């Protein structure tokens, strides 16, 4: 995951649930939190922020 993922295992995908405490899973990157629209400018080789 230094780039977009391409070889991913067989898992199903659901919809976005914004402004609510959920459990997320974005390409194997798990966690728990809320999701809101953001105003950051990702250059087209970056997948995530730190």
């Amino acid at each position: 995951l230094n780039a977009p993922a391409t070889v991913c295992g067989p898992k199903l995908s659901t919809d976005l649930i914004k402004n609510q405490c959920v459990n997320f899973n974005f390409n194997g990157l798990t966690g728990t939190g809320v999701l809101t629209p953001s105003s950051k400018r990702f250059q087209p080789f970056q997948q995530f922020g730190r």
């Binding site: 230094n2 780039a3 950051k40 970056q46 997948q47 995530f48 922020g49 730190r50």
Partner: peptide
Amino acid sequence: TQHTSSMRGVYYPDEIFRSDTLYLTQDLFL
């Protein structure tokens, strides 16, 4: 001839968005 490379040849270290930070890293730099 020889010249000097004044503050040239810095590149992005990895593929992670960062903003308003100072970041200390070790790599192969000019």
